[PDB]
Amino acid sequence: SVIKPDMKIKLRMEGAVNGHPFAIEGVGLGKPFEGKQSMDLKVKEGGPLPFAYDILTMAFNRVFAKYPENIVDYFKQSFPEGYSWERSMIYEDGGICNATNDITLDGDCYIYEIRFDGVNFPANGPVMQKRTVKWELSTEKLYVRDGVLKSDGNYALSLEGGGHYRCDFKTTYKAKKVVQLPDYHSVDHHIEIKSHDKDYSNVNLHEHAEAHS
Amino acid sequence: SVIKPDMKIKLRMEGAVNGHPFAIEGVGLGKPFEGKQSMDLKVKEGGPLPFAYDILTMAFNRVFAKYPENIVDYFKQSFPEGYSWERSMIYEDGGICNATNDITLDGDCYIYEIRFDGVNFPANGPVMQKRTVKWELSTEKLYVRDGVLKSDGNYALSLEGGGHYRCDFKTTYKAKKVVQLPDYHSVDHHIEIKSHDKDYSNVNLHEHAEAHSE
Where is the signal peptide, in residue numbers (chain B) (predicted)? Predict the structure, then answer.
């Protein structure tokens, strides 16, 4: 249809954590049918980031996920007009994050407009002390509530010096035009930071994702 | 003290709800020691607001609270340098808002810079359908955790045609300078929209708050 097997990505994020603003821009490319993408991200304002970069990675598009034939693919069907998502992320120690992304399609390139806001991360926590390592494999579960596609999952960040730090994700997905809705299914995400400079002013991020039922 | 019996307020709020941006500005006045204040608010971007105005009213300063002598007043002591707060609000139907306020003093005018972000309010909920009436009297409970003043509250909005719609508030307060921390105590808040135009582009908002303890 409108989905080429190789696509580009352009994005800008504006946001704040505990009231301190920052902005980040990125360019990437991926292969929506393989469910793989990668991108390079640069801090534009509010650098150097005084918090763990990992709370942002999942905010930096479910079109990049491999769907079998037997599962409805809400995300590929929603283009060219696009879709948006809303998301709340509740960390076990009271830290809470809200994000939105408005996704459009210009040529063979996706354009994200992302807003991100986190509050109540304690000063002695693993986020403000940058003591996180990586996200464990994430299983998102998607379902439909009143004509709207929703998902949630309970995820976990690995911690420096052992242990995990949990977080609960609730996301709402909205196509811009009416689209066929899927049945209950899961999506596994592997997300990883392959490289970065010391202060995370520059970051290279990869993700693989695949749906099941 | 730098806190005078009658003071002014200026504010700007920038936010978004379900991904749709807006901005509101306000002017007001109050009496710090009587724990009373009032203000007028005008939507400047994103009007008319497609959601219930009530989810914003508590974002629109604990310096305006009557503290008795036997409770430490963290807020009046934080000036002239000021203080800030961060806050999350979790409504029973999945709607979640975050806000921040940075509060400074200039002459005898408080200046707020407020950020507000709400997500996941369902289309058929009381918020997107503007079915809220008012906040019931709200009892905030403050305590200290690792050298920082926190608070929480279980609040409720009355709904059109009966029933209530519940929300959990969690706030962190941080003075700009080191200031003496209070003990556990409580604050009752009465907040009310005294008047507004048909679509809430103009709002006159009042609050009165009084601190209590054992």
Answer: none
Whole-angstrom distance, CA of residue B19 vs CA of residue A113: 10
- Between A19, A120, A148, which is nearest B102 by CB? A19
Q: Method of determination?
A: X-ray
Give which of B98, B150, B176 to mutate to test A binding, by max A Cβ within 10 Å. Answer: B98
Residue A124: its chain B contacts at CB < 8 A? 146
A206 has binding-site annotation: yes
For the CA atoms of chain A, what is the radius of gyration? 17
Q: Is B196 one of the annotated binding-site residues? A: yes
Q: Which residues of B touch A148 (CB under 8 A)?
A: 122-123
Q: Which of A84, A98, A148 shows the shortest C-beta gap to B98?
A: A98
Q: In this structure, how many other beta carbons lie within 10 angstroms of the beta carbon of residue B198?
A: 7
State the Cα–Cα distance between residues B185 and B63, nearest whole angstrom: 15
Helix (H) / strand (E) element for B192: namely strand B185-196
| Beta pairing, strands A20-31 & A7-17 | antiparallel
Domains along chain A? 1-213 (2.40.155.10)
- Strand-pair partners of B208: B36, B190
Resolution (A): 2.2
For B156, residues 6+ apart whose C-beta sits below 8 A from its C-beta are B135, B136, B164, B165, B166, B167
Q: Determine whether the interchain pair B115/A117 forms a contact, defined as Cβ–Cβ distance below 8 Å.
A: yes
- Bridge-partner residues for A14, per DSSP? A23, A115
Tokens linked to A143 = 């379902």
Kindly give, in sequence order, each residue whose CB lies less than 8 Å from that of residue B149, ignoring residues fewer than 6 positions away.
B74, B142, B143, B172, B173, B174, B181, B182
> Cα(B106)–Cα(B108) distance, rounded to whole angstroms?
6
